[PDB]
């Protein structure tokens, strides 16, 4: 109902084309600007003088590019958003004009005719103050060309809309326009004409913020949304998907239609596939029938593959369907009748997606293949029928479908081909085999990801983004970096994951949700990165994990407390592998020091390295130290640079180190402040340990 | 230089008051690309030779009468008319053929 916030990106470059792949690493990363913006500055001035002319909104299936123009055009009717810019708005659908064929501006005008029909005369005698808002300019198999230019026709005049349009954004009628054009896809050059100049805005999802808000204002008793939130704030996965407002409306309903009669909310769902088969499985109560969802799936597949959507009756005959399969099928909600003369339709385009991934696995038993849905990685087609044949995705339709189908050999078949179409590897690929959720298959499909790095932008692009480069063998290194403060080498292992956009406390609370299961991919870096109290929570529970296999781990310059030191020397006790711990250019105190130095003395916690370049340390916590260098069998290197240290503290480090039982072989320390007598002390410890060395800035 | 024309009574005073030089009569309008921006260039021709030739501006909007009477819907539109009757018309913002079809008619 209300208007739930997004996110809109305001890249400053067209992304038209990129036939040159990436080229130089800073061009790829110099690209992905970011620049968020408000719903109220979208037809703002924007970097230099000169205002855009075209916007486009793209963005994922069910992104919310189709409720953000009518949340705009129903806001400037009751006149809250540019009342002194815009004349008039005017709301047209791509989909509703693709229908007919005979259209003109005066007809467009009386049909959209939000207000009392006013003169057409001073209507077009006002150029720079009218807006146009179209609802997608993918899903109609237009053109959008004007017919050799040079000629403008009067209204009222018939002509297709495939010209119109096409001359509306071709600066020939009504040249000085603003256009709200919304698109799927990026590449519009072939189908605009003349493009150049345009706003590239990216439609996001719903943030932390805008879930709550959502969530809370769906039901109608406060429990209810309070046992919701709580179950899908539980199921990690989820809460990362849900940033789509389709996901979400998906997970409440099922949520609603569970709490209905009498249900114990349960999600065991982790990617957009098993909760459509759930809801699914929902609607499908008992009704051991099945043939009458293939025949239904059949003419979702037949209709997306013409264009179509609108279902006219006589189509349903041809493909099995009768009058009670149709009464079922609008009582269970699939389909929905509309207050329009007979025909039929879904009650999404997503839906009809689904329902045309299902009908090829339920016929069948590469991109050439997949010449009917098009649009390879850039269609969920694609990311629904991969998803569909993983072991999870080939769980839930055994029940509905009574035929057993095939067991892992129909992903195996499909192996090859992604193999050699996925040279270009890019993020919608990324989705599209996260979708496959499967060990057997994101072992050959990915073993390839010889990447540099990328830009991750959202909730579940950094979980699919963690989850993918997992599984591979060739990553060693995974980079994460504010990218301002982007310093970084260019080794094949390295994979940097730069990100231009602010985030709330979620960034990182999905991240370190994947490092379950970890292959290869032993050493983290996050340096840079601001975290929060229950971030690194987050972090010593997945140290917790026993199947959690992190090597070195580096935290430089992350802002962290006292009190998260505590909680990460108590998530050190459950592990044995971690090996190297970076605490460089961070903020400590001397308690601080004491809860590391506990541990440290222990046996276990075999950490061989230790870095506390600039964290502030005084003489006060070299006796802790001390203790740790005389008890720990196991420090091997130990960095106390950049510390205020003085002559106690040094004397005290040096009776630890005098011991016998000591391990560490290369010191850190400071010397310009130490006293005469300092360096002779230091300097006989050296002599009389020759496996001692202590080394400086240079 | 160019003259509005305001009704059908203007129009039929300019093609009397012409006398025997070319008559241009143009369709335009403000909405219109391709007229706004051959106007300046009609302009500049009719001022070279204004001796033998008159432009006349005629809005569309403001003389939907007059469009009805000579039967064009497409602008930009030139017609040229010779001893109060049209001798040849067109349409388009072509600046080469509308020069040389001047040319040819004067
Ligand atoms: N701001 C919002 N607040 C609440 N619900 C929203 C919001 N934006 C989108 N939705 C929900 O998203 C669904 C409609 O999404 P759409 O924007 O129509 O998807 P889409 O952009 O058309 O994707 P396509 O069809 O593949 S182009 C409905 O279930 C809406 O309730
Ligand atoms: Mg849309």
Redesign the interface.
Same mark, same amino acid.
Request: overall charge negative; proline content about 11%; aromatic content about 2%.
């Given at each position: 109902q209300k208007f739930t916030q997004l996110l809109l990106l305001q890249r400053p470059h067209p992304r038209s084309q990129d036939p040159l792949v990436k080229r130089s690493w800073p061009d790829y990363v110099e690209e992905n600007r970011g620049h968020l913006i408000e719903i109220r500055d979208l037809f703002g001035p924007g970097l230099d003088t000169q205002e855009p002319r075209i916007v486009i909104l793209q963005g994922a299936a069910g992104i919310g590019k189709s409720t953000l123009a009518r949340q705009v055009k129903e806001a400037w009717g009751r006149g809250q958003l540019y009342g002194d810019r815009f004349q008039h708005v005017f709301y047209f659908s791509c989909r509703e004009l693709a229908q007919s064929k005979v259209v003109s501006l005066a007809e467009l005008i009386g049909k959209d005719g939000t207000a009392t029909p006013a003169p057409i005369?001073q209507i077009?005698?006002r150029?720079e103050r009218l807006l146009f808002i179209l609802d997608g300019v993918d899903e109609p198999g237009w053109v959008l060309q004007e017919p050799s230019?040079?000629?403008?026709?009067?209204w009222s005049?018939p002509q297709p809309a495939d010209a119109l349009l096409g001359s509306l954004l071709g600066?020939?009628?009504?040249?000085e326009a603003s256009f709200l054009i919304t698109a799927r896809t990026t590449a519009l050059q072939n189908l605009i004409p003349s493009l150049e100049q345009a706003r590239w805005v990216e439609v996001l999802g719903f943030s932390e913020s805008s879930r709550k808000e959502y969530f809370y204002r769906y039901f109608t008793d406060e429990r209810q949304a309070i046992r919701a939130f709580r179950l899908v704030k539980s199921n990690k996965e989820l809460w990362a998907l849900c940033l789509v407002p389709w996901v979400s409306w998906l997970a409440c309903t099922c949520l609603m239609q569970q709490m209905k009669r009498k249900e114990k909310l349960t999600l065991t769902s982790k990617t957009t596939t098993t909760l459509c088969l759930h809801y699914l499985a929902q609607a499908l109560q008992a009704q051991p029938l099945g043939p009458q969802l293939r025949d239904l799936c059949s003419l979702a597949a037949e209709g997306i593959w013409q264009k179509k959507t609108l279902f006219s009756p006589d189509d349903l005959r041809k493909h099995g369907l009768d009058g009670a399969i149709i009464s079922t099928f609008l009582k269970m909600g699939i389909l929905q009748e509309h207050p329009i003369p007979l025909s039929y339709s879904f009650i999404h385009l997503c839906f009809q997606e689904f329902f045309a991934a299902m009908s090829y696995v339920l016929e069948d038993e590469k991109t050439l293949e997949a010449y009917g849905i098009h649009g390879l990685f850039g269609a969920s087609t694609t990311r629904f029928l991969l998803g569909l044949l993983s072991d999870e995705g080939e769980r839930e339709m055994e029940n509905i479908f009574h035929c057993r189908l095939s067991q892992g050999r129909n992903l195996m078949q499909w192996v090859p081909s992604l193999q050699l179409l996925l040279q270009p590897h890019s993020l919608e690929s990324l989705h599209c085999l996260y979708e496959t959720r499967n060990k057997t298959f994101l072992t050959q499909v990915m073993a390839h990801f010889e990447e540099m790095g990328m830009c991750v932008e959202t909730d579940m692009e950094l979980l699919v983004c963690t989850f993918c480069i997992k599984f591979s063998r060739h990553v060693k290194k995974l980079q994460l970096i504010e990218g301002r403060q982007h310093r970084s080498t260019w080794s094949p292992t390295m994979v940097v994951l730069f990100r231009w956009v602010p985030v709330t406390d979620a960034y990182w609370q999905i991240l370190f949700s994947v490092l379950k299961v970890t292959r290869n991919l032993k050493e983290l870096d996050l340096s840079g990165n601001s975290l929060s109290h229950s971030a690194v929570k987050s972090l010593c529970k997945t140290l917790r994990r026993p199947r959690c296999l992190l090597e070195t781990l580096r935290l430089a310059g992350c802002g962290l407390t006292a009190e998260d030191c505590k909680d990460l020397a108590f998530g050190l006790r459950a592990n044995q592998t971690l090996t190297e711990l970076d605490l460089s250019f961070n903020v400590l105190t001397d308690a601080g020091a004491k809860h590391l130095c506990q541990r440290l003395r222990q046996p276990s916690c075999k950490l061989q390295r230790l870095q506390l370049v600039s964290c502030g340390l005084t003489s006060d916590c070299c006796q802790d130290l001390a203790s740790v260098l005389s008890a720990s069998p196991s420090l091997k290197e130990l960095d106390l640079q950049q510390n205020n240290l003085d002559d106690v503290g040094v004397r005290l480090l040096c009776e630890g180190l005098r011991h016998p039982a000591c391990k560490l072989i290369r010191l850190g320390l400071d010397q310009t402040t130490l006293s005469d007598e300092m360096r002779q002390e230091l300097r006989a410890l050296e002599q009389e340990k020759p496996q001692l060395l202590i080394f400086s800035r240079r | 230089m160019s003259i509005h024309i305001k009704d059908s009574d203007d129009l039929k005073n300019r093609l009397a008051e012409a006398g025997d030089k070319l008559v241009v009569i143009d369709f335009m309008?403000?909405?219109?690309? +391709?007229?706004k921006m051959i106007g300046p260039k009609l302009d500049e021709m009719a001022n070279e030779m204004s001796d033998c030739i008159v432009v006349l501006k005629v809005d569309?909007?403001?003389c939907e009468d007059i469009?009805t009477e000579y039967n064009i819907?497409?602008? +930009?539109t030139f017609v040229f008319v010779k001893n109060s009757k049209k001798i040849e018309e067109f349409?388009?913002?072509?600046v080469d053929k509308l020069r040389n079809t001047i040319i040819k008619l004067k």
């Open positions: 005369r077009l005698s150029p230019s040079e000629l403008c026709l009067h005049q600066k020939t009628i009504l040249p | 309008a403000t909405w219109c690309g +391709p007229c569309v909007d403001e469009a819907n497409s602008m +930009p349409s388009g913002a072509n």
